[PDB]
């Protein structure tokens, strides 16, 4: 199974293994039970190196998971910003929303990642974008009491 392998070798980060993997004939979209793939998990660890590797083989940028979720969701929740802006270049929906309405601008602000939420409002993401609770990412990031995003976001309204 060169799908379970290039899953294990992307999440532990271990760039000379997927190369190879992606060489043999590993699917670059494997997909796990709950429907990550490997360029979910090499978002999730913050690996960057694999991320662009599993680009050039043209993985799905946009493939969801069973939650909605994509990559880029996965890259800003976790703070990582380099992974951010090269999913963004790839091509990767800065609007996408998963099944309780979060896009990742919902997930930058609730997490507090400033950096990552300038980088997305400069990709045009939607700031007045409301979850399945209405709520907007100035709502979310006011309500895990980071204020200077929320602040940010309610100038860019």
Do not use: C, M, W, Y
Not at 104 to 114: C, E, I, K, N, S
Not at 116 to 128: F, R, W, Y
Request: hydrophobic share 50%; net charge negative; glycine share 8%.
């Amino acid at each position: 199974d060169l799908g379970k392998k290039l899953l294990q070798a992307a999440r532990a980060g271990q760039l000379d293994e997927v190369r190879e993997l992606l060489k043999a004939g590993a699917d670059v979209n494997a997909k796990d039970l709950i429907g990550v793939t490997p360029l979910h998990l090499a978002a999730f660890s913050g690996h960057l190196e694999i991320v662009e590797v599993l680009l050039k083989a043209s993985a799905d940028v946009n493939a969801k998971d069973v939650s909605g979720r994509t990559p880029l969701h996965v890259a800003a929740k976790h703070g990582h910003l380099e992974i951010v802006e090269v999913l963004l270049k790839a091509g990767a929906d800065v609007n996408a929303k998963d099944l309780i309405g979060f896009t990742p601008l919902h997930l930058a602000a609730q997490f507090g990642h400033l950096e990552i939420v300038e980088v997305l409002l400069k990709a045009g993401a939607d700031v007045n974008a409301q979850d399945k609770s209405g709520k907007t990412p100035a709502d979310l990031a006011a309500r895990a009491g980071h204020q200077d995003i929320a602040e940010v976001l309610q100038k860019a309204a």
